[PDB]
Write a protein that binds this ligand. Sequence first.
Ligand SMILES: [Cl-]
Ligand SMILES: [Cl-]
Ligand SMILES: [Cl-]
Ligand SMILES: [Cl-]
Ligand SMILES: [Cl-]
Ligand SMILES: [K+]
Ligand SMILES: [K+]
Ligand SMILES: [K+]
Ligand SMILES: [K+]
Length: 325
Amino acid sequence: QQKKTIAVVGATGRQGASLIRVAAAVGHHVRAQVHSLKGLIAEELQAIPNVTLFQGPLLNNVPLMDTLFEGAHLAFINTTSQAGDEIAIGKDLADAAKRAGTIQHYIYSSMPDHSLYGPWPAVPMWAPKFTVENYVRQLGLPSTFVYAGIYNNNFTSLPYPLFQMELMPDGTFEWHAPFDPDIPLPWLDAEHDVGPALLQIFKDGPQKWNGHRIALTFETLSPVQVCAAFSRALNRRVTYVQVPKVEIKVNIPVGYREQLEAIEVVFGEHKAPYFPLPEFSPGGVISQRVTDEARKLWSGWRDMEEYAREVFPIEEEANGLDWML
Ligand SMILES: [Cl-]
Ligand SMILES: [Cl-]
Ligand SMILES: [Cl-]
Ligand SMILES: [Cl-]
Ligand SMILES: [Cl-]
Ligand SMILES: [K+]
Ligand SMILES: [K+]
Ligand SMILES: [K+]
Ligand SMILES: [K+]
């Protein structure tokens, strides 16, 4: 059958870019919204024949949304709080897809509202997405919701918050974070694995996935295990250190700081699960693991050890770091 056109919001982001590259390669035409045509990713995607970019802001720009969905049959939507009004943009996009009438399957990248499952605060950049999910669920078009695990490539030795693989004077690495050293966290190789997984959801179809929540995570590892993966990968001493507060070594926008403080409370103080929804956690009885559906969607997923050994050194050198010589 003719590969269907996919409308994408979040094209230059890790999830969108991953989907777009593989989707185009297998024949899908893509209509993607971007803030601006400039940028390494935007310029890269613009050069893919099957991809068409539409520049402009989404905030209060229903016309751009209508244009985006024109002639599209599939949609992958991942919004951001940066411009603010993420909830309004999410609803506007959903309504726009419905109005188009041609969208057969709408995939929205959602996150949990932790305040619904315990004496925990809602993580500011996550909870809003769940509100959009609830709204999307009530629209007449088939929809599926994917929950992204922590990006393997968040790790960097640059002084950025939460996921810094700090290079010490002796050449060893230390990762400091509020997470409990031994509680398994959900991870994800966004660049390589998000795209293939999303395409399989699209290939499976709306009858199989309408109304479903899928955890896009292929590997769970505690912080100590992540560091052990880097250690084996790099042949260097890498150790995890639990800290009460996130070490914020650089200036960050106010919204991110609030995101980090919520994280300190949720994972630091409370040790709550990353994915707190109940569905995410006798002879022959076998309970579903959080990584089961994702692995079934895409069997060629890559682990943390592969990232640390094969990609981390390149990304680091690309950022100007020198430890890899
Ligand atoms: Cl298709
Ligand atoms: Cl098109
Ligand atoms: Cl532009
Ligand atoms: Cl479909
Ligand atoms: Cl540092
Ligand atoms: K193009
Ligand atoms: K529905
Ligand atoms: K309705
Ligand atoms: K997500």
